Amino acid sequence: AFVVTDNCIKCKYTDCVEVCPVDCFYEGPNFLVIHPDECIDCALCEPECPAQAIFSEDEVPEDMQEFIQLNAELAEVWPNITEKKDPLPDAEDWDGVKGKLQHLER
Ligand code: SF4
Ligand code: F3S
Question: Which terminus of the chain is less hemmed in, N or C, by CB atoms within 10 Å?
Answer without folding.
Answer: C
